[PDB]
Amino acid sequence: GLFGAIAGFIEGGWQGMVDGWYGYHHSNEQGSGYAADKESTQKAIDGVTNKVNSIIDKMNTQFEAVGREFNNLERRIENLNKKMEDGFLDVWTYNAELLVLMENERTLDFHDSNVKNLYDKVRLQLRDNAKELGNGCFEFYHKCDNECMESVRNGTYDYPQYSEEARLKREEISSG
Amino acid sequence: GLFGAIAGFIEGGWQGMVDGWYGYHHSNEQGSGYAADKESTQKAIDGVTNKVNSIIDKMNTQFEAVGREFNNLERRIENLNKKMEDGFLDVWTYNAELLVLMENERTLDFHDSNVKNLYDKVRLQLRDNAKELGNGCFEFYHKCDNECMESVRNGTYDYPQYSEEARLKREEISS
Amino acid sequence: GLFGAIAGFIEGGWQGMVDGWYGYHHSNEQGSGYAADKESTQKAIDGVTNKVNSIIDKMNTQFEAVGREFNNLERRIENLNKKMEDGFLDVWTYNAELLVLMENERTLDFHDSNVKNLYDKVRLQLRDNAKELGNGCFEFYHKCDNECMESVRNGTYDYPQYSEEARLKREEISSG
Amino acid sequence: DPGDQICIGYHANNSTEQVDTIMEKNVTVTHAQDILEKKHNGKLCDLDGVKPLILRDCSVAGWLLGNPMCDEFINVPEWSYIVEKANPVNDLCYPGDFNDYEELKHLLSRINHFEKIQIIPKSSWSSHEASLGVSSACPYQGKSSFFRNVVWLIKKNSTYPTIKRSYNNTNQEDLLVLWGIHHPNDAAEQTKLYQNPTTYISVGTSTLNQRLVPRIATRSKVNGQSGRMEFFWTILKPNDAINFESNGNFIAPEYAYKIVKKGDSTIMKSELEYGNCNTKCQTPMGAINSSMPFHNIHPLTIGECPKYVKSNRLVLATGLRNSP
Amino acid sequence: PGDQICIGYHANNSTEQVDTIMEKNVTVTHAQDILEKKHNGKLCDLDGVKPLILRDCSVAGWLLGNPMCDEFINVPEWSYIVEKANPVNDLCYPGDFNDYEELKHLLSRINHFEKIQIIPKSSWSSHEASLGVSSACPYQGKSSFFRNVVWLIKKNSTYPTIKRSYNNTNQEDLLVLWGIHHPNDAAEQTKLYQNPTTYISVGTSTLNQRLVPRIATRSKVNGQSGRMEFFWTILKPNDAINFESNGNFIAPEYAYKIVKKGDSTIMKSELEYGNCNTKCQTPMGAINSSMPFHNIHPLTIGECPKYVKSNRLVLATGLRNSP
Amino acid sequence: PGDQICIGYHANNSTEQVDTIMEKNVTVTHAQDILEKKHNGKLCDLDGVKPLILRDCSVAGWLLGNPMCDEFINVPEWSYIVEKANPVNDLCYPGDFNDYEELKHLLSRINHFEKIQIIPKSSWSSHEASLGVSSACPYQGKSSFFRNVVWLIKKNSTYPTIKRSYNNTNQEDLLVLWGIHHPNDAAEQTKLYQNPTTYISVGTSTLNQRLVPRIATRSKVNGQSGRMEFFWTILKPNDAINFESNGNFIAPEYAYKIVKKGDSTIMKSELEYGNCNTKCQTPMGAINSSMPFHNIHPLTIGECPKYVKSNRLVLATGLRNSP
Ligand SMILES: *[C@@H]1O[C@H](CO)[C@@H](O[C@@H]2O[C@H](CO)[C@@H](O)[C@H](O)[C@H]2NC(C)=O)[C@H](O)[C@H]1NC(C)=O
Ligand SMILES: *[C@@H]1O[C@H](CO)[C@@H](O[C@@H]2O[C@H](CO)[C@@H](O)[C@H](O)[C@H]2NC(C)=O)[C@H](O)[C@H]1NC(C)=O
Ligand SMILES: *[C@@H]1O[C@H](CO)[C@@H](O[C@@H]2O[C@H](CO)[C@@H](O)[C@H](O)[C@H]2NC(C)=O)[C@H](O)[C@H]1NC(C)=O
Ligand SMILES: *[C@@H]1O[C@H](CO)[C@@H](O)[C@H](O)[C@H]1NC(C)=O
Ligand SMILES: *[C@@H]1O[C@H](CO)[C@@H](O)[C@H](O)[C@H]1NC(C)=O
Ligand SMILES: *[C@@H]1O[C@H](CO)[C@@H](O)[C@H](O)[C@H]1NC(C)=O
């Protein structure tokens, strides 16, 4: 994908996460589990719903064919009528098909972007208090209980609260 | 936004920056202040202007309605004429409205991308000589005066010139 | 570009890389050289080919003008015919030109995204075993022979094999 | 020791729904929305409770002129749309032409109900023979007959006096008036039927100023007849009158049609007939009951319908690329 | 605490909104409206050239010379023609105008006529040329008739066979108009033209016409059960038109030389002159705008923006504005 | 200094440029032109089938057999027809061709005629069949006439009533042509046809025609004040056409059996045969291309690219090429 998250540095999706499009999997001393990110999921839902409705509403004023009849000495205007109606039908079929193709591409890339942005949100919260594993996961340099995990998920992680413990752990690792 | 910068990890815009779309806010011993990024702002201006002109010019040869009249025994061709003209009007109204929607989305995402690219420009200039604060700001590990700030802004920051001071500061912090 | 790689933090392209759109340049004790990344280049080739074919096929059902003639007392329908055919020709010319413009922009940004994604693939393989120089290059903290370089290029770089050597080098540099 | 971990990920399921993009076809996604209706019931139904007028083996001309094989439609109730076959066998039983026929059908597309009214009684022709104008080309129950809404007048006692008749539209609705002219086979037939050799039919309203003259020619037999009937029509407005004058070949009106309800109708071409159903959207191939915004059944529809496209498939991606 | 540099973006107090596919009413720092929605509600000159505003007269009433249309006996060059939806001054004597819509279409490509007398009204020495008036065509309370044609009547109980020719010696095309009278009964036919069985033959290099009067009883329109049926042709340079008739002839007197051709139109509007000038005119009013689109009316003339049915068209130029 | 690996992208010396919404003339490493802009400027055979190039003859001059159109007395199967804008050999004797454009439309779906004699010129025993010639239709300096119809003249001061029939016993549709002569005056009517009051009646299963000559004085065209008015019909298999006339009859001799129907067209072009072959033809020349688009001419026939009014259509395939 354009944003390198879905099927990128995050190789695959989670069948275990059913209540959302994007989210987290945490693992600490108290256990492990999935938790869908409500805010990004709802923003994506709103975006996709508005997209579908906008496509449908932009096809509100498409050409509607009308039956007209002509006699045997009106072949020129009968052919003109046929070509006019067929032409408009082809134009609007092209519009529908092309819009669906283009917006499908944009929708897939939109999900990719949302995943990447959620990952970067967590990354910029944690900074050097955690290590980037390269697969979508962060390995904390400090103990991160369920309340810590929730502070990460809702965007209220307190870096200075754990910075000293993380520094001690980082120095221990770097010193071998 | 698609690129996560505008209204993303950079929470809000700056009312104090008036002379450009994107730029920097610096703070050192000599004071603090705003400075618009000349190059990226001019690039965005050129892009948006070309976009508007391209849309308008692509609407240069659109359908122009013509008045035609028919008598009471020409109702079929009168209806054909009306449907033809209305059809082309609907086609071009759709073209205009849809192009405006799609390119507005692309324009907002374009600004987002420009902000993100400027941020990454600064980030990849500074590397480990500064610490990423996570809100769009970098905290230098070395003293960075107004000329240093300008070297960052114009893309001529000299990493090896300050790398040793930054390394000492990082070692002091790690201890 | 939208993704900041092409003509961004990677200032320019490589005339020396001829067998691919994207790739690597390595330099170690055994020498230096270019190597095109087959996977990303082939993926981009497939994408661009499908795009060209999709555009052409979406212009498969465009309006075809037909010659019709009218006498001197059929000027109204003659004008209707002319305006209808010109209208459809203008509609399809607009469709072609606009689609070409939009998809050209998307193609350039697609190449940009592919370059950035390849860079991030290498970056997330290496992690702190190499130093990010900021110009598209990584400087290893450990010795990386041709087998190591090829493991980086094919996506099988084994971080734990070099992690201790890299840590020793990083500690030596940070300590002075 | 390995520290605690938090991972960022995305949804996956066992969906096999696929979508297309410009650069990639058949992309499996976790969620998608089909927006193209492709199914119909294959029946002609009532339109919001209003039954259509299904002409079966009769054409619009056979109905309006009263082809004696079209007695099923002598008095039809209000309709929602009209259904006509591609080539109805009961048309102009006596061969000929219907002037401005397609313009009349176009007018019909905006009419929902006629009320037939007698404007000139068949029994009011005291100086002409009014009950001999029948032909084997228009059989009814084995007998020679003729279009029921017009009267083929014939000379009486070797004389055809000049007809001067008027009808004033004292109704409040527009009136569809039909009449005709007989083009005979030769001058001998002209004398035999109408006595007078040089004839005309003048017709006048506030807007119509017509004078028809018979065209004698040698023609191929159609339905056994070499003569021709050519029919003409007009819309007589309220308080306007129509005046006929003729010294021969006059196919006079008897019944006209009051336009009692105007509305959105259409003449649908279909070989189907009544399906004893109700629908909100009707096509010549069948009715549509759908919430889809698009359909590909048939471009000519009537009612509250989705938008027609020629596509065989239209699927919007809503979810993300599904991991196998 | 070390020195800091921050990356940020512009924000202001703009309330301009744009729409996208995924989000409506997005506030942006800068936007550009591209839809013109205003007009002056007047009919103006088009780049200094005044339109022909027919007021209560139709095109037929003008060209035939309906005596209630004397305002247009000699019109100067025009930029476009304005006709009401239902002009009251049309065919004062009821009837039909043959190929009328084709003639109006031709008029849409003409900017100026020069009236020329092709057959002097005083040149009818064997027929009565000043008795063809009707109460259906009043002028100041007097019975009158279309001014550009002559309703010829028998003279001393005789209507000799008319044979008249006009050769177009001008360098421009000539619009020639004539007509035929369809009377009520044979008595009126005899009273007006003496001859009971009449015709009008008209010939050019391309026209080969023979009209026959239709004597019949019709509903009264403007008090008349008779009808006038009018015909026209374009007589090309060096071609001649020949008329022959023994009755019911509505003869030409004045024809119209086509002296200037160009891109024009017949605009349907109830408005009248507004004493203004513009570069773009619509039936509802003139447009003075630099915007590329407008939604006033699809039928325009001049240097105009492109018409769309949109109620709003705003392009985003700035960024999403932070509250 | 440690070992290094760098990520980069292709560059070359390509100068190919593409356009985008935000930037024009973007140099790319690879691009694909999709617009064909060249043609050979010739009219060629269409997949081995030679077109019918009428040169100085019109469709009417061909079908009626204008004696200046003997090149087309018997044409083989064609792929498309080429007619000039204003062919000089049209109706040599002036007049009209009824429903001419509807006939040309029918011709657009026909690829081959077989001429058939339906009424032998030598079968006119009671009329003069070899005197109907005019100086308006010269052939080799002598007065002549359309070859596929016969201008019948009275014989020994008599014109007996013609009653002739042709039954289409073929399996194909038959294009049948006939006409009527509108003379200049009654003296000419008597001179040519004796009978003063004449008619032509024509009947098939669908056709019910009765023509009456219009005698009038008209402008001379090709030296003639009279006119010829031509009519046509499609006679279906097993149907018959019946003619009856006591004067002014321009009788059929040859009709056209429709032996092959298919996709054809009447192309307007001043060019003539170029002794070439092609897969795609335009009025300006042939196209030999694999491009999906072309901008040569909208009216094409064959396996052609799609026409657009564009002057340039280049798709980007490679990346932005660094200078
Ligand atoms: C038909 O009859 C009605 C009355 O039964 C006539 O009504 C008149 O209509 C004219 C307009 O055409 C009016 O000027 C009169 O004032 C009406 N009079 C009345 C008493 O209603 C009507 O004229 C008749 N139609 C025709 C064609 O003569
Ligand atoms: C109308 O009058 C003009 C003369 O002004 C006629 O033009 C002549 O036409 C003949 C051809 O028949 C030429 O040989 C002459 O040279 C023309 N004369 C001039 C002065 O150019 C024209 O024929 C007349 N039209 C009709 C229908 O009789
Ligand atoms: C033209 O001639 C053919 C052949 O003689 C006629 O075809 C016959 O038509 C009748 C019915 O009308 C059939 O019973 C015969 O079997 C047909 N014969 C053949 C050989 O097909 C045809 O009727 C004639 N057309 C006209 C108008 O008289
Ligand atoms: C996509 O899948 C369908 C079957 O669901 C198949 O018919 C079609 O050929 C496929 N298209 C491509 C491009 O593989
Ligand atoms: C692009 O280049 C062409 C020459 O190939 C030039 O004519 C044109 O003006 C250029 N367009 C722009 C926008 O500079
Ligand atoms: C024209 O087409 C023929 C057959 O496809 C081919 O041999 C020839 O090379 C083509 N001409 C050109 C100029 O490509």
Side-chain angles (χ1 to χ4, degrees), chain D residues 229-249:
Chain D
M229 295 291 174
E230 190 173 16
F231 294 100
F232 297 79
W233 59 275
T234 194
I235 301 299
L236 188 61
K237 290 184 170 175
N239 274 17
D240 196 13
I242 185 162
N243 300 273
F244 298 95
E245 181 181 303
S246 175
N247 65 336
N249 309 69

Side-chain angles (χ1 to χ4, degrees), chain A residues 127-164:
Chain A
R127 285 136 67 185
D128 60 349
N129 276 9
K131 183 171 62 184
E132 189 164 19
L133 296 183
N135 63 344
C137 299
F138 300 91
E139 184 186 9
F140 291 87
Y141 289 118
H142 61 85
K143 297 294 182 180
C144 187
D145 53 18
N146 293 344
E147 165 178 20
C148 170
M149 293 297 180
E150 178 60 32
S151 76
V152 177
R153 292 190 297 258
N154 60 29
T156 64
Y157 173 79
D158 194 359
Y159 173 91
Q161 178 178 333
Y162 314 95
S163 61
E164 182 68 12

Side-chain angles (χ1 to χ4, degrees), chain E residues 238-274:
Chain E
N238 276 17
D239 196 12
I241 183 163
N242 298 272
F243 299 98
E244 182 180 303
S245 176
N246 64 335
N248 309 68
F249 188 26
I250 311 299
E253 173 167 29
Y254 291 98
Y256 293 93
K257 187 161 52 176
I258 304 173
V259 296
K260 187 171 183 177
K261 301 171 182 176
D263 217 354
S264 191
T265 190
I266 301 180
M267 186 174 298
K268 288 298 212 173
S269 179
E270 305 306 305
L271 300 176
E272 281 172 40
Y273 197 48

